[PDB]
Short mmCIF file of C-alpha atoms in Angstrom, two decimals:
data_model
loop_
_atom_site.label_atom_id
_atom_site.label_comp_id
_atom_site.label_asym_id
_atom_site.label_seq_id
_atom_site.Cartn_x
_atom_site.Cartn_y
_atom_site.Cartn_z
CA UNK E 13 -98.58 34.00 118.45
CA UNK E 14 -95.19 32.65 119.57
CA UNK E 15 -95.30 28.85 121.32
CA UNK E 16 -93.02 26.55 122.17
CA UNK E 17 -93.08 23.20 119.92
CA UNK E 18 -93.75 19.83 121.10
CA UNK E 19 -91.80 16.88 121.52
CA UNK E 20 -94.05 14.94 118.43
CA UNK E 21 -93.44 18.24 116.38
CA UNK E 22 -89.35 18.16 116.93
CA UNK E 23 -89.77 14.41 116.13
CA UNK E 24 -91.66 14.57 112.86
CA UNK E 25 -89.30 17.71 112.20
CA UNK E 26 -85.99 15.75 112.21
CA UNK E 27 -87.89 12.81 110.64
CA UNK E 28 -87.76 15.14 107.49
CA UNK E 29 -84.69 16.81 108.06
CA UNK E 30 -83.31 13.47 107.96
CA UNK E 31 -84.71 12.80 104.48
CA UNK E 32 -83.20 15.92 103.19
CA UNK E 33 -79.70 15.29 104.70
CA UNK E 34 -79.96 11.42 102.81
CA UNK E 35 -80.22 13.24 99.61
CA UNK E 36 -76.77 14.50 99.38
CA UNK E 37 -75.41 11.34 99.29
CA UNK E 38 -74.61 9.88 96.12
CA UNK E 39 -75.74 6.39 97.03
CA UNK E 40 -79.18 7.81 97.24
CA UNK E 41 -79.55 10.01 94.65
CA UNK E 42 -78.46 8.75 92.30
CA UNK E 43 -77.68 5.62 93.45
CA UNK E 44 -81.11 4.74 94.66
CA UNK E 45 -80.54 2.61 97.68
CA UNK E 46 -80.75 3.41 101.05
CA UNK E 47 -76.46 2.61 101.71
CA UNK E 48 -75.57 5.95 104.16
CA UNK E 49 -74.98 6.15 107.92
CA UNK E 50 -78.20 7.91 108.65
CA UNK E 51 -80.38 5.79 105.94
CA UNK E 52 -81.31 3.35 108.51
CA UNK E 53 -83.83 5.92 109.75
CA UNK E 54 -85.64 6.04 106.38
CA UNK E 55 -84.79 2.33 104.89
CA UNK E 56 -88.09 1.11 104.91
CA UNK E 57 -89.18 3.25 101.97
CA UNK E 58 -89.21 2.32 98.31
CA UNK E 59 -87.18 4.67 96.46
CA UNK E 60 -89.54 4.79 93.03
CA UNK E 61 -87.16 6.78 91.47
CA UNK E 62 -84.56 9.32 90.98
CA UNK E 63 -82.96 12.12 88.74
CA UNK E 64 -79.95 14.18 88.76
CA UNK E 65 -80.68 16.80 85.62
CA UNK E 66 -78.41 17.55 82.96
CA UNK E 67 -78.31 21.52 82.83
CA UNK E 68 -79.64 22.53 86.57
CA UNK E 69 -78.21 19.62 88.23
CA UNK E 70 -81.53 19.41 89.95
CA UNK E 71 -81.25 16.08 91.98
CA UNK E 72 -84.40 14.64 93.36
CA UNK E 73 -86.12 11.66 94.40
CA UNK E 74 -89.96 9.84 94.60
CA UNK E 75 -90.10 7.44 97.39
CA UNK E 76 -93.30 5.59 98.93
CA UNK E 77 -94.00 4.46 102.70
CA UNK E 78 -96.73 2.35 102.67
CA UNK E 79 -96.30 1.80 106.88
CA UNK E 80 -96.24 5.44 106.49
CA UNK E 81 -98.82 5.66 103.92
CA UNK E 82 -97.40 8.52 102.53
CA UNK E 83 -95.53 9.37 99.07
CA UNK E 84 -92.48 11.09 99.76
CA UNK E 85 -91.01 13.92 97.42
CA UNK E 86 -87.49 15.01 98.66
CA UNK E 87 -85.27 17.59 97.06
CA UNK E 88 -81.28 17.82 97.44
CA UNK E 89 -79.61 21.42 97.86
CA UNK E 90 -76.31 22.35 95.94
CA UNK E 91 -73.39 19.95 95.71
CA UNK E 92 -71.10 22.94 96.62
CA UNK E 93 -72.89 24.76 98.84
CA UNK E 94 -70.08 27.10 100.50
CA UNK E 95 -69.89 28.19 96.98
CA UNK E 96 -73.92 28.28 96.15
CA UNK E 97 -74.23 30.31 98.81
CA UNK E 98 -71.36 32.87 98.42
CA UNK E 99 -72.45 33.14 94.85
CA UNK E 100 -76.46 33.12 95.15
CA UNK E 101 -77.84 36.26 92.91
CA UNK E 102 -81.62 37.08 92.97
CA UNK E 103 -83.44 37.64 89.68
CA UNK E 104 -86.86 38.59 90.15
CA UNK E 105 -89.04 37.26 87.49
CA UNK E 106 -92.62 36.65 86.76
CA UNK E 107 -94.45 33.33 88.18
CA UNK E 108 -96.38 32.00 85.70
CA UNK E 109 -99.29 30.49 87.38
CA UNK E 110 -100.22 33.61 89.32
CA UNK E 111 -100.34 36.49 87.53
CA UNK E 112 -99.13 39.98 89.78
CA UNK E 113 -96.30 37.23 91.60
CA UNK E 114 -92.55 37.14 91.17
CA UNK E 115 -90.12 34.34 92.31
CA UNK E 116 -86.19 34.07 91.51
CA UNK E 117 -85.46 33.03 88.13
CA UNK E 118 -83.00 30.56 89.15
CA UNK E 119 -85.39 28.23 91.64
CA UNK E 120 -88.19 28.25 88.50
CA UNK E 121 -85.19 27.03 86.19
CA UNK E 122 -84.09 24.09 88.68
CA UNK E 123 -87.45 23.01 89.34
CA UNK E 124 -88.40 23.48 85.73
CA UNK E 125 -85.99 21.11 84.80
CA UNK E 126 -87.64 17.92 86.78
CA UNK E 127 -91.11 19.04 86.54
CA UNK E 128 -92.68 16.97 83.96
CA UNK E 129 -91.25 13.86 85.06
CA UNK E 130 -91.37 14.34 88.39
CA UNK E 131 -95.17 15.42 88.73
CA UNK E 132 -95.88 12.59 86.35
CA UNK E 133 -94.43 9.65 88.62
CA UNK E 134 -96.14 11.45 91.57
CA UNK E 135 -99.53 11.34 90.23
CA UNK E 136 -99.01 7.89 88.96
CA UNK E 137 -98.20 6.81 92.55
CA UNK E 138 -101.28 9.02 94.01
CA UNK E 139 -103.37 7.09 91.60
CA UNK E 140 -102.40 3.87 92.90
CA UNK E 141 -102.54 4.82 96.64
CA UNK E 142 -105.35 7.96 96.87
CA UNK E 143 -105.45 7.38 100.65
CA UNK E 144 -101.94 8.21 100.99
CA UNK E 145 -100.68 11.72 102.11
CA UNK E 146 -98.28 13.59 99.95
CA UNK E 147 -95.07 14.98 101.42
CA UNK E 148 -92.59 17.47 100.07
CA UNK E 149 -89.20 17.94 101.89
CA UNK E 150 -85.91 20.03 101.25
CA UNK E 151 -82.71 21.76 102.57
CA UNK E 152 -81.19 24.97 101.16
CA UNK E 153 -81.67 25.18 97.22
CA UNK E 154 -83.97 22.11 97.80
CA UNK E 155 -86.23 23.69 100.09
CA UNK E 156 -86.87 26.26 97.39
CA UNK E 157 -87.60 23.70 94.78
CA UNK E 158 -89.75 21.48 97.32
CA UNK E 159 -91.83 24.53 97.62
CA UNK E 160 -91.85 25.56 93.97
CA UNK E 161 -93.20 21.65 93.25
CA UNK E 162 -95.80 21.72 96.09
CA UNK E 163 -97.80 24.44 94.72
CA UNK E 164 -97.61 23.05 91.24
CA UNK E 165 -99.11 20.30 92.63
CA UNK E 166 -102.07 21.56 94.18
CA UNK E 167 -102.64 23.73 90.96
CA UNK E 168 -102.81 20.48 88.97
CA UNK E 169 -106.04 19.99 91.38
CA UNK E 170 -105.86 16.21 91.17
CA UNK E 171 -107.01 15.37 94.52
CA UNK E 172 -103.63 17.03 95.81
CA UNK E 173 -105.16 19.49 98.51
CA UNK E 174 -104.07 21.09 102.03
CA UNK E 175 -105.73 18.41 103.68
CA UNK E 176 -103.33 15.51 102.05
CA UNK E 177 -100.11 17.76 100.97
CA UNK E 178 -97.51 18.83 103.19
CA UNK E 179 -94.44 20.80 103.04
CA UNK E 180 -91.44 20.85 105.24
CA UNK E 181 -88.40 22.70 104.66
CA UNK E 182 -84.61 22.98 106.25
CA UNK E 183 -82.50 26.41 105.66
CA UNK E 184 -84.79 27.53 102.71
CA UNK E 185 -83.88 31.02 101.17
CA UNK E 186 -86.92 33.36 100.48
CA UNK E 187 -88.33 32.47 97.29
CA UNK E 188 -90.79 35.52 95.97
CA UNK E 189 -92.17 38.84 96.84
CA UNK E 190 -95.00 39.63 99.01
CA UNK E 191 -97.16 39.05 96.67
CA UNK E 192 -96.03 35.67 95.80
CA UNK E 193 -96.01 34.69 99.72
CA UNK E 194 -99.83 35.56 100.11
CA UNK E 195 -100.37 33.49 97.15
CA UNK E 196 -98.89 30.54 99.21
CA UNK E 197 -100.71 31.35 102.28
CA UNK E 198 -104.11 31.23 100.27
CA UNK E 199 -103.55 27.66 99.32
CA UNK E 200 -103.86 26.65 102.85
CA UNK E 201 -100.96 23.88 102.54
CA UNK E 202 -99.47 22.98 106.12
CA UNK E 203 -95.98 24.45 105.34
CA UNK E 204 -93.30 24.15 108.49
CA UNK E 205 -90.28 26.44 107.70
CA UNK E 206 -87.40 25.25 109.81
CA UNK E 207 -84.68 27.58 110.50
CA UNK E 208 -81.17 26.69 112.45
CA UNK E 209 -80.26 29.10 114.94
CA UNK E 210 -78.40 32.08 112.82
CA UNK E 211 -78.49 30.23 109.73
CA UNK E 212 -77.71 33.03 107.14
CA UNK E 213 -79.66 31.09 104.10
CA UNK E 214 -83.75 31.89 105.45
CA UNK E 215 -82.32 35.56 105.36
CA UNK E 216 -81.17 35.61 102.01
CA UNK E 217 -82.03 37.78 99.69
CA UNK E 218 -81.67 40.96 102.32
CA UNK E 219 -85.06 41.92 103.83
CA UNK E 220 -84.07 45.01 101.56
CA UNK E 221 -84.68 43.27 98.51
CA UNK E 222 -87.90 42.86 98.52
CA UNK E 223 -88.66 39.03 98.86
CA UNK E 224 -90.71 37.76 102.02
CA UNK E 225 -91.54 34.32 103.51
CA UNK E 226 -95.03 32.56 103.79
CA UNK E 227 -94.87 29.04 105.72
CA UNK E 228 -95.02 28.83 109.60
CA UNK E 229 -91.50 29.54 111.20
CA UNK E 230 -90.15 26.83 113.81
CA UNK E 231 -86.93 28.40 114.82
CA UNK E 232 -84.17 26.01 116.65
CA UNK E 233 -82.80 28.52 119.40
CA UNK E 234 -80.85 25.78 120.84
CA UNK E 235 -79.58 22.15 120.59
CA UNK E 236 -79.21 20.65 124.16
CA UNK E 237 -81.59 20.13 124.59
CA UNK E 238 -83.03 20.65 121.33
CA UNK E 239 -85.47 23.69 121.76
CA UNK E 240 -87.64 24.94 119.08
CA UNK E 241 -89.59 28.46 118.77
CA UNK E 242 -92.90 28.46 116.33
CA UNK E 243 -94.12 32.00 115.09
CA UNK E 244 -97.49 30.61 113.92
CA UNK E 245 -97.89 33.60 111.51
CA UNK E 246 -98.48 31.93 107.94
CA UNK E 247 -96.23 35.30 106.61
CA UNK E 248 -92.94 35.73 107.80
CA UNK E 249 -92.52 37.93 111.32
CA UNK E 250 -89.86 39.71 113.13
CA UNK E 251 -90.35 37.26 116.11
CA UNK E 252 -88.25 34.17 115.07
CA UNK E 253 -85.08 34.07 113.38
CA UNK E 254 -85.34 37.55 111.75
CA UNK E 255 -84.59 38.62 115.70
CA UNK E 256 -81.14 37.84 115.12
CA UNK E 257 -80.19 39.82 112.26
CA UNK E 258 -77.65 40.80 110.91
CA UNK E 259 -75.59 38.44 112.83
CA UNK E 260 -75.74 35.28 110.95
CA UNK E 261 -74.11 32.29 110.63
CA UNK E 262 -72.82 30.23 107.39
CA UNK E 263 -72.11 26.95 109.79
CA UNK E 264 -75.88 26.82 111.26
CA UNK E 265 -76.96 26.06 107.78
CA UNK E 266 -74.76 22.97 107.59
CA UNK E 267 -76.39 21.30 110.75
CA UNK E 268 -80.35 20.54 111.75
CA UNK E 269 -80.83 18.63 114.68
CA UNK E 270 -77.78 17.58 115.07
CA UNK E 271 -77.47 16.11 111.25
CA UNK E 272 -75.00 17.43 108.77
CA UNK E 273 -77.84 18.70 106.21
CA UNK E 274 -75.33 19.49 102.94
CA UNK E 275 -72.44 16.72 103.27
CA UNK E 276 -73.90 13.65 103.87
CA UNK E 277 -71.60 13.45 106.77
#
């Protein structure tokens, strides 16, 4: 099906796009403070911890919202996005937890570098607030790591399942082949994949290389008034953003809902 997103659904996706946008501020990661212009939206969240890894430069954080009863996981995209786009090269490798599936090596190496410590900090918080929900979000590169993070959490089968684990991504590139996308749909995890108009990143690598997207597609088709088309299928369809290919845009990547995503502007 194809349907229009509700007011409430746009409000929720703008909230996750803000957390994503905020993560590109050096005072947020690794500063560990809510000292930024749009931080006022999330400033009531308690920042548990932040990371800026050494080899892959993986920037992420764990935050806790008590009034929201949510444990938040946020992944930053690249600190030099134009360049990240211009140079992305895909290197399909086996995804270890699931035999018969392939993922781009570079996303596994990014996650791989923060995994241990991050997952221990999230289980520690979840053991203390078991009633809360776990929400993962990230834009661009951050969206690919966010997806690998949510699968890892579900796979630890620690009380995190489709009913209390949510993934929200903005401008995310495809991460694995068809077989890996099927696997993602098989977990049942609520996955909202947001695409901002003609943003070229959600169309990389080219359709021709063999990768495919999982997650319900929320496509921003207009910004004033904000309009979003939802392709409810959990696998990639030709009915939302793929309909504009190959006439994509690099600048559409840098703004979601009106928020600069990538420059903490």
